Structure formats: structure tokens, C-alpha cells
């Protein structure tokens, strides 16, 4: 397996991705340990162009661990003020 | 079963 | 702030998922310009972007390579390690 | 200004 760094050069504002899951969920639809997952990537959006993929489990956001994060904790981390948005992910 | 999906 | 970055592309033997334009045999800065990166392709997954310039491929310098010389470098016979310049 | 483009 591999850990992968996917970096989104933000115009910031829209990322073009959706997430499901988090530590506050006792299950997810992707792989059986709780976590936050990419559940959607808009085909012509930033995340898609940058190589993000449905099924990616988000491990960290700009260095911040989100393996155990609640859903809202992961949302807050992803919405940090504009920079390159560096996602450490794993595909189970 | 259903999971909230947050669009960003 | 500009950067130089080492990007590894694990080729399956099929497509890389990127296009290049230019080269030392065209009038229009060193290296090979990446002109398209398919979102679903390996190049996108590996971190490559439109506007990146390829300076080296697996230790072969391509800063002053012609278009065909850069194509050959990228299609070297069956882990593609690219040194790229990014603005 | 017309540059060859190759898809790879």
C-alpha cells in the first residue's frame, strides 16, 4: 500500500469535493475503521484536476491529523484560510 | 443507512 | 512562490495522462511544458499540473530537449521520476 | 504561433 499527498492549488473558496464520515459516526460506506472519506469529486472541479479520488481516506490536512476527527472537525480543517491545500490520504 | 455528505 | 519538485509517476504501461508542448526546436524558458493533465489519469494523481515544466526524467536532463527528444524521454521503455519547475 | 502537442 501507499500514503499519498494530493495538493490542491486553491483559488480557494470552491474545492469541488465532498466528504462523508468521521469519528462521530459508528460506520462508513467505504475499509472498516472510522474516518473521513472523499465521497464525491466534481468532474471539472479543483479536487478532480489535482488528482483527488472518491474513496480517499483523509489522514491529514496541511499537517493537521484528521484520522480521528469528527466530521465537523474535518470540515473546519478543510476550510482554513486560503493556501495550497495538502491532503495526506490512503486508499484501503 | 444514510451518511450526511458535506460539499466543499 | 515558485518551486522545483520531484514527482514520481508509477506507469502501468498505458497512458501517463498528460500532454506536452514545445521544446528547444520551438521558439516559445527551459524544459518541456505540460499543456494538459487528465483529471482521472496517473499524472494528475501523482501531482503534475498544467504549466509545470519538465527539466529531467529519470536522470536524463531534458532542459534543452527537442519536442521529440522529450517525448522519447517520457516514453522510455518499461517508475517515472520527473523533476519539474512550477511557478 | 503553433506548437506541436503530444498526448502521453
Chains D and B touch (3+ CB pairs under 8 A): no
Which residue of chain D is at minimal alpha-carbon distance from C67? D4
C84 touches chain A (CB under 8 A): no
Specify the experimental method.
X-ray
Grid cell listed for C52 = 509545470
Which residue stretches of chain A are H helix?
46-49, 71-78
Terminal alpha carbon distance of chain B = 23
A15 touches chain B (CB under 8 A): yes
Strand C53-57 and strand A84-90: the pairing is unpaired
Alpha-carbon gap, residue C52 to A92, rounded angstroms? 30
DSSP one-letter code for C40: T
Chains contacting chain C through 3 or more C-beta pairs under 8 A: A, D
Terminal alpha carbon distance of chain D = 22
D2 vs chain C: nearest CA distance in angstroms?
Answer: 9
What is the experimental resolution, given in Å to one decimal place? 1.8
List of chain C residues whose C-beta atoms are within 8 Å of the C-beta of residue A83: none
Residues A57 and A36: beta-carbon distance below 8 Å: yes
Selection from C39, C75, C46, C35 nearest residue C58 by Cα: C75
Residues C20 and C84: beta-carbon distance below 8 Å: no
Q: Which residues contact A9 (CB under 8 A, 6 or more apart)?
A: A46, A50, A84, C49
Grid cell listed for C20 = 506536452
Alpha-carbon gap, residue C41 to C45, rounded angstroms? 7
Contact C47 A9 (CB under 8 A): no
Q: How far is CA A36 from its chain centroid?
A: 7
Provide the chain A residues 6-45 that lie in CB contact (below 8 A) with chain C. 6-7, 9, 43-44
Grid cell listed for A10 = 486553491
Q: Could you tell me the domains of chain C?
A: 1-87 (2.30.42.10)
Contact C46 A51 (CB under 8 A): yes
Alpha-carbon gap, residue A16 to A52, rounded angstroms? 10
Alpha-carbon gap, residue A72 to B6, rounded angstroms? 9
Amino acid at each position: 500500500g501507499s500514503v499519498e499527498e494530493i495538493r490542491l492549488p486553491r483559488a480557494g473558496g470552491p474545492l469541488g469535493l465532498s466528504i462523508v464520515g468521521g469519528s462521530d459516526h459508528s460506520s462508513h460506506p467505504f475499509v472498516q475503521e472510522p474516518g473521513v472519506f472523499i465521497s464525491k469529486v466534481l468532474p471539472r472541479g479543483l479536487a478532480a484536476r489535482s488528482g483527488l479520488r472518491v474513496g480517499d481516506r483523509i489522514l491529514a490536512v496541511n499537517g493537521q491529523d484528521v484520522r480521528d476527527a469528527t466530521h465537523q472537525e474535518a470540515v473546519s480543517a478543510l476550510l482554513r484560510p486560503c493556501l495550497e491545500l495538502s491532503l495526506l490520504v490512503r486508499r484501503d | 443507512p444514510a451518511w450526511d455528505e458535506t460539499n466543499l
